[PDB]
Amino acid sequence: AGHMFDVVVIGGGISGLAAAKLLSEYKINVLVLEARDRVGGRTYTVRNEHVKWVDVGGAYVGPTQNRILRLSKELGIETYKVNVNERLVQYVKGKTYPFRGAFPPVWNPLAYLDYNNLWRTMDEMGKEIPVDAPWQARHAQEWDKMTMKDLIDKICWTKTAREFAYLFVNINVTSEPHEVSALWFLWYVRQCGGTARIFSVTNGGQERKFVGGSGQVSEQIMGLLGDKVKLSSPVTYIDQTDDNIIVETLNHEHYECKYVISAIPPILTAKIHFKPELPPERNQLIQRLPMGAVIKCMVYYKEAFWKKKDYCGCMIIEDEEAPIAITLDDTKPDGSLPAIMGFILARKADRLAKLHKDIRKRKICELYAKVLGSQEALYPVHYEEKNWCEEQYSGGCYTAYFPPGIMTQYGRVIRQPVGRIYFAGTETATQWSGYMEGAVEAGERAAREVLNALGKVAKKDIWVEEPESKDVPAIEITHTFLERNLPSVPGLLKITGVSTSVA
């Protein structure tokens, strides 16, 4: 039944459990309330005979995501490289264009320069931002007033390199470039390791998945806690005016504790009614950090027909109409159950959600067909999907995004405690915020904060550096001499003394 504990953790997510774990290891009586009838939250592994196991939520891990990898291993969970042996393909206006490498290739000289200048510039601006304190950047104020679009259109002279920029935004933040803050975005990418890493599959965060499903990490870490993790128990009230903190749920349950760690998305923090009304700053901020929109879709075929054309599941579709933006081969390691994973992002997310499951499915197939070639794409065996906009206790999926003007006003708070209530959740991470590893950073960070508050941990050993995973080495990023110096579209015209004319 409902009793008294030392620390009560709201959130059965990775970040939640991570904290719960660490806390138990310090022999602390911690309780963990989860609202869903399951655990893992934004990470969710669906199991049925048609697919065995599938990460319908969080799934990919990579090179610098040491924190998650470590915890993953400790829990006895394996990683498996994502298939990229074949060719990648870019679908632009006309048709499909095979290619190999990080980003697709651009052959128009001007575009090429603009395109390159883009990525390079975004990273240049990024270096100027404090990973742990975006709002502290030099040009911090000027930038946060600018929409990622504004910025993109201010540095892209090629309609090509520009639309591409947009997509990049869609793919990494599940939102439109005009919906988010340039300042924030620049940070998000930087906080992950620059454009290169955040996008690469061969050496990026999309390098590999978990054998058995990323979901397992939460499931596992729950078994180690067992008794101390109440499911279907949505926290709904936190009263911390007394010597003991009160915490009642929606099950009508009641629990008291000495400290609280919130391991749920900032925006969802509002599902809770706080006794001493939270401070303006927080109160105000908790209503400005929206969850992006995405529908993860896996289409299963009886055979990886794309391999027959030296094409790996990966496709980068740039075409208004098309439902999916990017895709990947989600076939199993043992070649079992070939399938293709694709994403429906931002604007498209809501648009396609207006259709019937079947129709949507079709649309997707019809697409994969044209992009690839063989109509073998029109005859799927099974189809699994997940629209995270529906989820009440998640809001959306690739974390929350900061809109224009918010980062530089109420941002300084995300991780700041509100008297005995500490904050976790990947949204408060510093490295890979938004990703699973990001969740861990926080889950633990918050945990240690509370431990320090109990005298068990020094104010120093609260923020701990992670040992580079020897199983997934952090191969440095090769930055070509050309890339480092090739002029920008404007740069080329300033070299060719071209600005004194009427084009």
Ligand X SMILES: *[C]C1=C([C])[C]=C2C(=[C]1)N([C][C]([O])[C]([O])[C]([O])[C]OP([O])(=O)OP([O])(=O)O[C][C]1O[C](N3[C]=NC4=C3N=[C]N=C4[N])[C]([O])[C]1[O])C1=NC(=O)[N]C(=O)C1=N2C#C[C]N([C])[C][C][C]OC1=[C][C]=C(Cl)[C]=C1Cl
Q: How far is the CB of 169 from ligand X (least distance, A)?
A: 11
User: 180, 316, 339, 447: which one contacts ligand X (CB under 6 A)?
Assistant: 316
Question: Cβ distance 31 to 228 under 8 Å?
Answer: yes
* Partner touching 340 among ligand X, a copy of itself, none, CB below 5 to 8 Å by kind: none
Q: How far is the CB of 392 from ligand X (least distance, A)?
A: 8
Please tell me whether residue 387 binds a copy of itself under the rule CB under 8 A.
Answer: yes
- Residue 41 neighbours by CB under 8 Å, 6+ apart: 11, 12, 13, 14, 16, 34, 57, 218, 393, 394
| DSSP β-bridge partners for residue 246 | 239, 256
Residues 85-124 that bind a copy of itself (CB under 8 A): none
Q: How far is the CB of 315 from ligand X (least distance, A)?
A: 7
Report residue 131 as tokens: 């990973």
Please tell me whether residue 12 binds ligand X under the rule CB under 6 A.
Answer: yes
Among residues 179, 170, 183, the alpha carbon closest in space to that of 122 is found at: 183
User: 75, 224, 231, 389: which one contacts a copy of itself (CB under 8 A)?
Assistant: 389
Among residues 136, 16, 128, 173, the alpha carbon closest in space to that of 411 is found at: 136
Tell me the C-alpha distance between 478 and 467, whole Å. 22
Please tell me whether residue 294 binds ligand X under the rule CB under 6 A.
Answer: yes
Tell me the C-alpha distance between 394 and 389, whole Å. 8
C-alpha angle with apex 245: 43 to 235, nearest 5 degrees? 35
DSSP conformation class of 87:
E
User: 20, 28, 35, 418: which one contacts ligand X (CB under 6 A)?
Assistant: 35
Q: Residue 287: what residue type? A: Q
* Partner touching 280 among ligand X, a copy of itself, none, CB below 5 to 8 Å by kind: a copy of itself
Please tell me whether residue 350 binds a copy of itself under the rule CB under 8 A.
Answer: yes
Strand, helix or coil for residue 282: helix
Among residues 138, 116, 112, the alpha carbon closest in space to that of 125 is found at: 138
Please tell me whether residue 267 binds a copy of itself under the rule CB under 8 A.
Answer: yes
Closest-approach residue to ligand X (CB): 13
The footprint of a copy of itself (CB under 8 A) covers 145-147, 149-150, 175-176, 178-179, 234, 236-237, 250, 252, 267-268, 270-274, 277-281, 283-284, 287-288, 290-291, 293, 347, 350, 353, 387, 389-392, 395-396, 403-406, 409-410
Q: Which residues bind ligand X (CB under 6 A)?
A: 10-16, 33-36, 41-43, 57-61, 88, 171-172, 199, 201, 206, 234-235, 263-265, 268, 271-272, 294, 296, 314, 316, 326-328, 388, 393-394, 397-399, 425-426, 434-439
